[PDB]
Structure 1
Amino acid sequence: MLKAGVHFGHQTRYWNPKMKPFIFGARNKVHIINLEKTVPMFNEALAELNKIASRKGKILFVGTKRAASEAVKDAALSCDQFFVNHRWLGGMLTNWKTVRQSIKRLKDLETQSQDGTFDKLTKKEALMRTRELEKLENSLGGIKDMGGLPDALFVIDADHEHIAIKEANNLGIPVFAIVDTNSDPDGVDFVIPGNDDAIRAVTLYLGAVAATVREGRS
C-alpha cells in the first residue's frame, strides 16, 4: 500500500531481467512495483505460509541483513516463529544431526535453573551459570524448541541470505523471499514485494507476515 503516495529505496536506472514483470515505472525517480498487484502477490504466498503452519510446519526466519538483525524477534515476540541472525557458513543448517548436541546441552540448563538446588549459593550458579544460559540463548535459543529441520525458510534479501538459500536447497526446504528492484529467484520458491533496507517499514512488515504462524495454533 502507498496511502499518501510516498515512495523510497534503492536504484534509479538499474534493474535486472528477472524483476522485469514486477516494475511498472518510477516514482521519486526510484523504480516502483505495480500498486494494483502488490497486495494479491503478497496474500498469495502468505496463505501457503499459513497452511504450512496449520499442519504443524515450523517456520525459520533469517535476519542476517541489518534491517532485521533485532526485529526478527523484537518485532515478532508473539508469532510462534524460529529465528537466526548470526553469520552463515557451510553446515550452518545442513549439520543439524550434529548441532542437536548443543540443543541437548541448552535443555540441560533450563531443566536445572528452575530448581531451588540452583539458588542455594550467592553466585556459583544463580549468577555464573545464569550468565552461561543467557549466552547460549543468544546463539541457539531462537531454534531450541524447533527440532530437526524447518518446513519453510524466510529471507529478507536473496543477495545477502544466499547461503541460507544454498543450505535450504540442499535439504529441500521451500524458500520465501522479499523483492524490491534487483532480485534473483534462483533457489527461491515464493516471492513477495516489500522492504529490505528500511529503518522503519521492516518492523511492521514482519508482523504483517509472521502473525499468521500463531494462527497455526487454532
Structure 2
Amino acid sequence: MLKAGVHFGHQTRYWNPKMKPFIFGARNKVHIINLEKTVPMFNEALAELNKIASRKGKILFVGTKRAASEAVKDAALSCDQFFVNHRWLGGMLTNWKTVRQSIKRLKDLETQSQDGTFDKLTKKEALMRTRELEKLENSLGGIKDMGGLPDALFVIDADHEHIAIKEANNLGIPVFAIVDTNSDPDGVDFVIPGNDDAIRAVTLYLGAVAATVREGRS
C-alpha cells in the first residue's frame, strides 16, 4: 500500500526493449522504472493474488538469488505458504511426479533422522544420510509440505528465474513477477516493474505480498 520508498529502478546493462513502456530512464546511463506505472501494476497483483489467496490456494514464492534468501523463507513462512530459495530444480512443476518421490524421500529421511534409527549400524553412512538431508532440505525446502502443484507462482526475478516462469506458463499457473529493466514479460500474467536485486526493495516488496496473502477479514 505504501509508496515504493527506495529502489527507483536499475540495470544500465542488457536492458530489454519490451520494458520500454515501464521506463522513465534518465540518470547516469542507468534506467529508472516509472513507479507511477508500478503502483497500479503492483496493486493489481495484490488484488488478484489476494483473490486466489482467499480461495485457499498455494502460492510458491521463488527466491533463488541472494539476498532473496532468507527473505522468501521469512515471507513465505510468515504465511502458511511455500517457497524455493536455493536452486530451483529444472522441472519441479512440469514433472512434479518425480519430484513427488524426492519429497517423499525427504519426509522419510527426516522421520528416520530426528526420531528413528539414525545412530544405527554406521557412522559414515549416517553422516552420508544426514548430508542427504542437507541437500534435499535446501533444494526441496518449502515445497516439501505442498502436496499439490500450486495455484499461483510469485517469482522475484524474471530473467534469473526464467525456468520457473516457463513451466508455470507451460502448466497454466498465474505468474506474478517483479521484472527489472533487463527482464522480459514472457508469460508473466501480472508483471510488476520493479527492482529485483535490492534487499530493501524485495523486503518491502515481499512484505506487501506476504501481508496480502494472510490478510484476514476476521
TM-score range, shorter chain: 0.7 to 0.9
Looking at secondary structure, tell me which structure has more strand per residue.
Answer: 1
Alignment-derived partner of residue 185 in structure 1: 185
Deviation (angstroms), 1:2: 9.8
The Cα offsets for residues 125-170 of structure 1, whole Å up to 9 and x where unpaired, read as 9999777656543222311111121111111222111111122122
Moved more, 114-123 or 27-36: 114-123
TM-score (norm 2): 0.78
Deviation (angstroms), 1:117: 8.6
Is this contact kept in 2: 1:54–1:217, CA < 8 A?
no
The Cα offsets for residues 18-42 of structure 1, whole Å up to 9 and x where unpaired, read as 2222223435663323343332221
Provide the C-alpha distance between the structure 2 equivalents of 1:19 and 1:66, rounded to a whole number of angstroms.
23
Is this contact kept in 2: 1:24–1:33, CA < 8 A?
yes
Unaligned runs of 5+ in 1: none
Alignment-derived partner of residue 105 in structure 1: 105
Is this contact kept in 1: 2:76–2:83, CA < 8 A?
no
Deviation (angstroms), 1:181: 2.0
Is this contact kept in 2: 1:50–1:216, CA < 8 A?
no
Shift in alpha-carbon separation, 1:164–1:98, aligned structure 2, 3 A? same
Alignment-derived partner of residue 58 in structure 2: 58
Is this contact kept in 2: 1:64–1:84, CA < 8 A?
yes
Moved more, 111-120 or 176-185: 111-120
Instruction: Please tell me whether Structure 1 or Structure 2 has the larger radius of gyration of its CA atoms.
Output: 1
Shift in alpha-carbon separation, 1:106–1:13, aligned structure 2, 3 A? closer
Shift in alpha-carbon separation, 1:158–1:129, aligned structure 2, 3 A? closer
**Among the aligned pairs, what percent are the same residue?**
100
Moved more, 122-131 or 148-157: 122-131
Provide the C-alpha distance between the structure 2 equivalents of 1:138 and 1:21, rounded to a whole number of angstroms.
38
Looking at secondary structure, tell me which structure has more helix per residue.
Answer: 2
Is this contact kept in 2: 1:152–1:175, CA < 8 A?
yes
Provide the C-alpha distance between the structure 2 equivalents of 1:3 and 1:101, rounded to a whole number of angstroms.
44
Shift in alpha-carbon separation, 1:130–1:32, aligned structure 2, 3 A? same
Shift in alpha-carbon separation, 1:8–1:193, aligned structure 2, 3 A? closer
Moved more, 76-85 or 145-154: 76-85
Provide the aligned length of Structure 1 versus Structure 2: 218
Unaligned runs of 5+ in 2: none
Deviation (angstroms), 1:101: 1.6
Provide the C-alpha distance between the structure 1 equivalents of 2:185 and 2:141, rounded to a whole number of angstroms.
30
Shift in alpha-carbon separation, 1:114–1:66, aligned structure 2, 3 A? closer
Moved more, 70-79 or 125-134: 125-134
The Cα offsets for residues 86-112 of structure 1, whole Å up to 9 and x where unpaired, read as 334543321211221222333335556
Shift in alpha-carbon separation, 1:114–1:7, aligned structure 2, 3 A? closer
RMSD: 3.7
Deviation (angstroms), 1:175: 0.8
Provide the C-alpha distance between the structure 2 equivalents of 1:128 and 1:80, rounded to a whole number of angstroms.
31
Is this contact kept in 1: 2:13–2:182, CA < 8 A?
no
Provide the C-alpha distance between the structure 2 equivalents of 1:19 and 1:200, rounded to a whole number of angstroms.
22
Shift in alpha-carbon separation, 1:129–1:11, aligned structure 2, 3 A? closer
SS at 1:101's partner residue? helix
Alignment-derived partner of residue 145 in structure 1: 145
Deviation (angstroms), 1:3: 7.6
Is this contact kept in 2: 1:158–1:183, CA < 8 A?
yes
Moved more, 70-79 or 23-32: 23-32
